[PDB]
């Protein structure tokens, strides 16, 4: 029987943390900071998708170009395979073609 | 697994409460129960 007997330890949360209290701050820097910076410089993540949306395939492509040369062989290979697959899936297999 | 089901037992019960009084597996085994229950309905 999958369901469990003892109800979990109560997940206490501080909504007034240093993160959540100052969430969204500066985000909106340009429109009232004479456009020194863009809010796409605020976003901190992977170097390839840093102010750039994308698809799955597109993302993969981006990764391959911007990082590829400094990727782990095995991982690179996997990425390549994915790209190969993804292209096939998009450009051929599907509905509405 | 992101988001998988926790409230499954309840769903099963929701069918099985009607099969309670049948003969055989039908009253226990959900797969069989459901078919019987629907027919009854």
């Amino acid at each position: 029987i999958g369901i469990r007997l003892t109800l979990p330890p109560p997940k206490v949360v501080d909504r007034w943390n240093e993160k959540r209290a100052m969430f969204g701050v500066y985000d909106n820097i340009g429109i009232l900071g004479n456009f020194e910076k863009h809010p796409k410089e605020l976003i901190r993540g992977p170097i390839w998708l840093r102010g750039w949306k994308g698809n799955e395939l597109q993302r993969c492509i981006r990764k391959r170009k911007m990082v590829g040369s400094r990727m782990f062989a095995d991982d690179l290979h996997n990425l390549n395979k994915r790209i190969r697959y993804l292209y096939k899936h998009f450009n051929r297999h599907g509905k509405f073609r | 697994l992101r988001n998988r089901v926790t409230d499954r037992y309840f769903r099963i019960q929701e069918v099985l409460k009607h099969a309670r009084h049948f003969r055989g597996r039908k009253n226990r085994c959900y797969r069989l129960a459901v078919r019987t229950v629907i027919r009854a309905f």
Binding site: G2, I3, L7 | T6, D7
Partner: peptide, 26 residues
Amino acid sequence: VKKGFRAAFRFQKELERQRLLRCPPP
């Protein structure tokens, strides 16, 4: 160990109900 809480709560309630049905108070 699944991620929820509501389901667990419901189950607890059910259990309680069952208990009540079984060995009720005076």
